[PDB]
Design a binder for this molecule. Structure first.
Ligand SMILES: CC1(C)CN=C(N2CCN(c3ncnc4sc(CCF)cc34)CC2)S1
Length: 466
């Protein structure tokens, strides 16, 4: 059921042809998510999954795409009886949305590896009957659009996806799974998640996509990996060009993570005449501040990673202290495990490796070393403060003695003469967490009291009896 106008660009013989397609779709009233996702999954399949016979670009003929498109729309139209779900006010009902979600779910293979690569697209759904977690939510939205339900939109946190719909787009519905081992709440609102101030629901500062942002999501979803070691240059270029297209049209304005993904791509392979990755990371951050009350964690993690890879130790630490400043006003809930892992890996692997190198470079005579900069020591402390504050009032603990060992080691990298220059007030720094407040005097002694530090960090009551 494609319109004659959407067919004129075919066949697609090149990356630039795919970009022309997207631009034409984006100039329309409602870009066609089904068409666009089919095309990306097709080309991703023949550039990443099976390159046999590849000479330049896998040609997307209209006969092939139209047949995929027809399989999808026939599956959805046939299995969803809209007449049974009357639409008041030109908005969808919860039962209708649940029904679409059930159709997608019931079409999927009984068993498969749910986080393999290349199972995100409608191509994967049709040819493979497999979708990853967010792919299911995207497919529900695509299905809703092809049934004419213009109110159904994709909602995205930093680690999960669902739908919004209904009067004013105010209703929420779960339509996919989260994580591994969690029992579904498909059909339900996200309101308990928002109420408990978990990271997973961003205190309600999650993204509510319009169609343009749904197009942005599928482009971010492009997966250019051929194996653990190798990426498709063709697909990295396609993703990059598509992201610039979206950028120029205003459509990454409210999409921090997309700005981050574009910055990562620019770092690897910069486009002449475009903003620096650093500028891009900073726009990502300014977008979170403007649209999502600065409640997103990844904007500052994207920045910190870049600074870490380029060994701007001071800037990396600042950025991570910034990520802790955001997290401190959340409660660590069951299901926030991915963010816990990111923080754990930063504190207990990434920072220690950076500081160990810095200590060698210092022994080798560096000037302006992070280890001689009290502002760097304050950032480190700010990072730990936000983590301790995050833990306060949470239903599950964050810190344990495994964290404390690395804390002691990280503090020890800074001489007392540097650590003593940080002014902790009730570089100047204020602690929000009771743990770090109680630590203040230990942090500036010449010799680090390691056991004391550990006690204060884990709030473990006692030392060894014997
Ligand atoms: C700083 C980082 C550790 C590096 N990559 C990160 N991400 C890779 C890109 N990601 C994303 N990028 C665009 N859109 C979305 S929507 C979503 C939740 C599941 F739907 C994730 C995600 C996940 C975040 S965060």
């Amino acid at each position: 059921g494609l319109k004659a106008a959407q067919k004129t660009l075919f066949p697609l013989r090149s990356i630039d042809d795919v970009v022309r397609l997207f631009a034409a779709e984006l100039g329309r009233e409602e870009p066609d998510l089904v068409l666009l996702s089919l095309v990306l999954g097709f080309v991703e399949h023949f550039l990443a999954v099976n390159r046999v016979g590849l000479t330049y670009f896998p040609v997307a003929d209209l006969s092939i795409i139209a047949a995929l498109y027809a399989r999808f729309t026939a599956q959805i139209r046939g299995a969803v009886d809209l007449s049974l779900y009357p639409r008041e006010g030109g908005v969808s009902s919860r039962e209708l949305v649940k029904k679409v979600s059930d159709v997608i779910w019931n079409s999927l293979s009984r068993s498969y590896f749910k986080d393999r690569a290349h199972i995100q697209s409608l191509f994967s759904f049709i040819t493979g009957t497999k979708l990853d977690s967010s792919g299911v939510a995207f497919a529900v939205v695509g299905a809703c659009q092809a049934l004419g339900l213009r109110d159904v939109h994709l909602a995205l946190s930093e680690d999960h996806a669902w739908v919004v719909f209904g009067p004013n787009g105010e209703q929420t519905a779960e339509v996919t799974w989260h994580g591994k081992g969690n029992e579904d709440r498909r059909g339900q609102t996200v309101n308990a998640g928002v109420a408990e101030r978990s990271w997973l629901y961003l205190k309600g500062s999650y993204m509510r996509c319009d169609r343009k942002m749904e197009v942005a999501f599928m482009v971010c979803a492009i997966n250019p990996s051929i194996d653990l070691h190798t990426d498709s240059l063709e697909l990295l270029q396609l993703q990059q060009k598509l992201l610039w297209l979206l950028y120029d049209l205003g459509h990454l304005e409210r999409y921090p993570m997309a700005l981050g993904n574009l910055a990562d791509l620019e770092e690897l392979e910069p486009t002449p005449g475009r903003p620096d990755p650093l500028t891009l990371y900073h726009k990502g951050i300014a977008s979170a501040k403007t649209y999502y009350r600065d409640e997103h964690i990844y904007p500052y993690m994207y920045l910190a990673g870049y600074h870490c890879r380029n060994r701007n130790v001071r800037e990396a630490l600042q950025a991570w202290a910034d990520t802790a400043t955001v997290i401190q006003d959340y409660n660590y809930c069951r299901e926030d495990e991915e963010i816990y892992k990111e923080f754990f890996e930063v504190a207990n692997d990434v920072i220690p490796n950076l500081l160990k190198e810095a200590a060698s470079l210092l022994e080798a005579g560096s000037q302006g070393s992070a280890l001689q900069d009290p502002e760097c020591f304050a950032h480190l402390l700010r990072f730990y403060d936000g983590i301790c504050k995050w833990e306060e009032g949470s239903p599950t603990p964050v810190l344990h003695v495994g964290w404390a060992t690395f804390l002691v080691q990280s503090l020890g990298r800074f001489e007392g003469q540097v650590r003593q220059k940080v002014r902790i007030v009730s570089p100047v720094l204020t602690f929000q967490s009771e743990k770090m407040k109680g630590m203040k005097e230990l942090l500036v002694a010449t010799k680090i009291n390691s056991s004391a530090i550990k006690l204060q960090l884990t709030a473990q009551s006692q030392v060894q009896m014997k």
